[PDB]
């Protein structure tokens, strides 16, 4: 069939005429990005002639090919530490939440890292890591273990839920998080008054949309 | 360790931020004398007095001025194939 | 070495040519590295075979250089376009992008000029010595519920004060400074004050 | 078959009638004595950057 | 026959280093594109369409995956609206009030004034107003009362 480009849906302008929304939801999509890759790195010297000598001297009548392609991969593999920090280092203190996490009715426990595991992940990065999955050639490992990259989303985390923006231009500084979602609303054009009069509303409304990431990510 | 074999370095269980890296998560340094071997830290811990009705407030600030280095454009170069390889 | 990343492009690239001159050195099973070697001591149906051999080599020198040239080439465009980028939005204008030009609240940028890249010295706004102050969502008056206009309530342990958010500037509490929303039955966390009406006393 | 290599016995099995392993990278991981018909793994000697 | 082996192995290898070292860039890409959306909607908040999930953004929470990050974009999206008529501008007395913020609108019989993302009607008082130029000049501009407080 010709495909569809979507729903016909016209607006119903006049030139006296506005819509204003009467209530909100708050809805919570996930998007994924690769930061890294594997550090593969071969010997081009072992690759083509593995242990023979006699073709070892024919290779070396090719001058520094070899010595451009091992280069070349190096170069590829130390990148990878760059992105891999340039993403989640961006923090300059390792920060955690207190003892009673209670941030107004707001649940971040898919969020935060589970104490009781062996691998300190959020029941959400326990699914994402799940989910997904000799001839002169090795395998470097990173820089930065799983156990550390952990540990700096915990970080970034921490600091989001109790000190908002203020730890990423400065010090880190305490607010109560519905205040910080207050001045969040206040910062797309709502009046801050909608998030408390809605509060309960609002914490419910994200507790369901979080439920719902750790569910769609398994199932699809 | 993972990264391979390291001789020379003594491990301790002392965690610094990192220097030399050698990967997975251990880095090395030199103190004073010898050069050790560490699991690196990622940062001071600090944890912030988080309370329902509890706000800090800056009050004062400094001005702060950072550099930022970019590459722009490189070398301008260009070779005649005719001439290099063969003559 | 702050200024490493230009030094390392400048390197890079003198280091790929440099590599490039020395393949004409290799004679990549040629019988010389040398093309006169070939041409003056072999008959032509022979110097044919080993001068394609050095043609061959030499080419696909070339053309490895060339590709890895290209791609470099990608590299800095894009470095080019973000540096294009900061000057209009921090150098030509105020960036509200966090951490996209220096650590802190940007104020302005300055650019300098740098042999192959640009320098931006970014100025920016950093909060320091901080205090905790008791805080609260709204303060509750004549039944009315009153959130700060632009700002956080905040009290020293005996006084309720209205204080702009990214600097403790304590103002007193006044019906200018805050606006009316509802009762005080419905906000959370809601504490009792007194509002002050600056007409009242001129009334 | 030829190769340079550390051999060793390994908990594997061939039917009676294969002389070699192959992984699916066409790289020979496993053979069979011709005399003493057991299987030995073969590993690579170790190598990498110093 | 070697000689031929190893031009072979080589021109291979060059293949896998090559297309290996563009794909490098493309993560490198993404990475870059990682870290601007790190620092800019979860170390503050986006004021940028489409930047960090659809709706306005309100916040974000990166999680760790295998080679690479993954973001919980929470954004507010209006839900249900409403129609209601509308005015650039409201007729006093002579003189031609404009709203502060927000917008003015009139549920067929009664005109207030309220903030764009979230219906919730004001009296149009002078507090949420100001004047500029005469009832004269404004097209579509609509006759009601301003309450001076
Ligand atoms: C935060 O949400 C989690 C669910 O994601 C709550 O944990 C559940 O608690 C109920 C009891 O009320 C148990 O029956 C479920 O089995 C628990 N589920 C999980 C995954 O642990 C948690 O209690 C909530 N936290 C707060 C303070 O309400
Ligand atoms: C605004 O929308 C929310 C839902 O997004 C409404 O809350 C729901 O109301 C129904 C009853 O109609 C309940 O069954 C649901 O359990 C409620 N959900 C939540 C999260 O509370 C809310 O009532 C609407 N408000 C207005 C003024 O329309
Ligand atoms: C909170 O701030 C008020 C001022 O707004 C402080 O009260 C004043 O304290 C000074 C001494 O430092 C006296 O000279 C003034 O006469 C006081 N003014 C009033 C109206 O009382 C108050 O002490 C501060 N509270 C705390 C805990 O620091
Ligand atoms: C703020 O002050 C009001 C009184 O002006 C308090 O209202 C009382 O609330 C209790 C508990 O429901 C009632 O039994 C009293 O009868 C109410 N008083 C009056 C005069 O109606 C209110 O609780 C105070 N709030 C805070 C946070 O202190
Ligand atoms: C527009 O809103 C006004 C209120 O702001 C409505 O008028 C009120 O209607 C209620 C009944 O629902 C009465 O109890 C109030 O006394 C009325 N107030 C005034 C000032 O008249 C008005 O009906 C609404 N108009 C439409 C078309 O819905
Ligand atoms: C708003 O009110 C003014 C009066 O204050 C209206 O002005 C009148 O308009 C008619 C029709 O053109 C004239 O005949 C009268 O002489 C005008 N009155 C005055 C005092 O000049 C105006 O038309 C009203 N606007 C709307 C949209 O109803
Ligand atoms: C260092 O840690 C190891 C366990 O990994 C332990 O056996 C050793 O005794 C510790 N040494 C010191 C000085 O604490
Ligand atoms: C906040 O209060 C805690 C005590 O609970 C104190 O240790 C901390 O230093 C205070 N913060 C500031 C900026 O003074
Ligand atoms: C803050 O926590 C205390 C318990 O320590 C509780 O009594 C109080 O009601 C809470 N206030 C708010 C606004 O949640
Ligand atoms: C080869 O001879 C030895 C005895 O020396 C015997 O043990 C072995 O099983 C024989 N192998 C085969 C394949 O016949
Ligand atoms: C506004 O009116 C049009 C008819 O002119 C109708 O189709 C549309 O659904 C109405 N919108 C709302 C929010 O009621
Ligand atoms: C809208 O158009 C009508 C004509 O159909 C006109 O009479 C009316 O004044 C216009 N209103 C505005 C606000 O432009």
């Not at chain 3, 205090?131 to 009290?155: L, M, Q, Y």
Request: glycine fraction near 6%; aromatic fraction near 8%.
């Amino acid at each position: 069939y010709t495909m569809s480009l979507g729903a016909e849906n016209s607006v119903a302008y006049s030139n006296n005429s506005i819509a204003i929304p009467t209530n909100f939801t708050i809805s919570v999509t996930t998007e994924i990005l690769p930061v890294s890759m594997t550090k593969t790195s071969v010997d081009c010297t072992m690759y083509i002639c593995g242990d023979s000598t006699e073709c070892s001297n024919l290779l070396l009548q090719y001058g520094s090919f070899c010595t451009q392609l091992n280069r070349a991969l190096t170069g590829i593999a130390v990148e990878q530490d760059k992105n891999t920090q340039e993403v989640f280092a961006q923090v300059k203190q390792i920060y955690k939440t207190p003892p009673i996490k209670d941030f107004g009715g707001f649940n971040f426990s898919q969020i935060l890292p589970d104490p009781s595991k062996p691998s300190k992940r959020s029941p959400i990065e326990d699914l994402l890591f799940n989910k997904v999955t000799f001839n002169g050639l090795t395998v470097l490992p990173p820089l930065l273990t799983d156990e550390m990259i952990a540990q700096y989303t915990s970080a970034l985390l921490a600091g989001t839920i109790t000190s908002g923006w203020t730890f990423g231009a400065g010090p880190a500084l305490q607010i109560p998080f519905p205040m910080q979602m207050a001045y969040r609303f206040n910062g797309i054009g709502v009046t801050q008054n909608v998030l408390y009069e809605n509060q309960k509303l609002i914490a419910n409304q994200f507790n369901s949309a979080i439920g719902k990431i750790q569910d769609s990510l398994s199932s699809t | 360790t993972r990264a391979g074999c390291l001789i020379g370095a003594e491990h301790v269980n002392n965690s610094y931020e990192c220097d030399i890296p050698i990967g997975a998560g251990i880095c090395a340094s030199y103190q004073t004398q010898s050069i050790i071997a560490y699991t690196m830290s990622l940062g001071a811990e600090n944890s912030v007095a988080y309370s329902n009705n509890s706000i800090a407030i800056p009050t004062n600030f400094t001005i702060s001025v950072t550099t930022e280095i970019l590459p722009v454009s490189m070398t301008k170069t260009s070779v005649d194939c005719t001439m290099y390889i063969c003559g | 070495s702050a200024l490493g990343k230009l030094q390392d492009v400048v390197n890079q690239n003198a280091q790929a040519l440099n590599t490039l001159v020395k393949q004409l050195s290799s004679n990549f099973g040629a019988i010389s590295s040398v093309l006169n070697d070939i041409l003056s001591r072999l008959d032509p149906p022979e110097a044919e075979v080993q001068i394609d051999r050095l043609i061959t080599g030499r080419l696909q020198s070339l053309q490895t250089y060339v590709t890895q040239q290209l791609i470099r080439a990608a590299e800095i465009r894009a470095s080019a376009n973000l540096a294009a980028t900061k000057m209009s939005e921090c150098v030509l204008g105020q960036s509200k992008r966090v951490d996209f030009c220096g650590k802190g609240y940007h104020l302005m940028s300055f650019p300098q000029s740098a042999p192959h890249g640009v320098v931006f010295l970014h100025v920016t706004y950093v909060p320091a010595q901080e205090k905790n102050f008791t805080t609260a969502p709204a303060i509750c008056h004549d039944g009315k519920a009153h959130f700060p206009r632009e700002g956080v309530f905040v009290s020293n342990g005996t006084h309720w004060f209205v204080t702009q958010r990214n600097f403790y500037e304590p103002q007193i509490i006044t019906t200018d400074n805050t606006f009316v929303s509802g009762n005080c039955d419905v906000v959370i966390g809601i504490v009792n004050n007194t509002v002050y009406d600056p007409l009242q006393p001129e009334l | 078959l030829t190769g340079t290599g550390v051999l060793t016995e390994s908990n594997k099995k061939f039917l009676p009638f294969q002389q070699f392993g192959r992984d699916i990278a066409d790289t020979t991981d496993a053979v069979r004595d011709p005399q003493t018909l057991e299987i030995l793994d073969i590993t690579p000697c170790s190598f990498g950057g110093v």
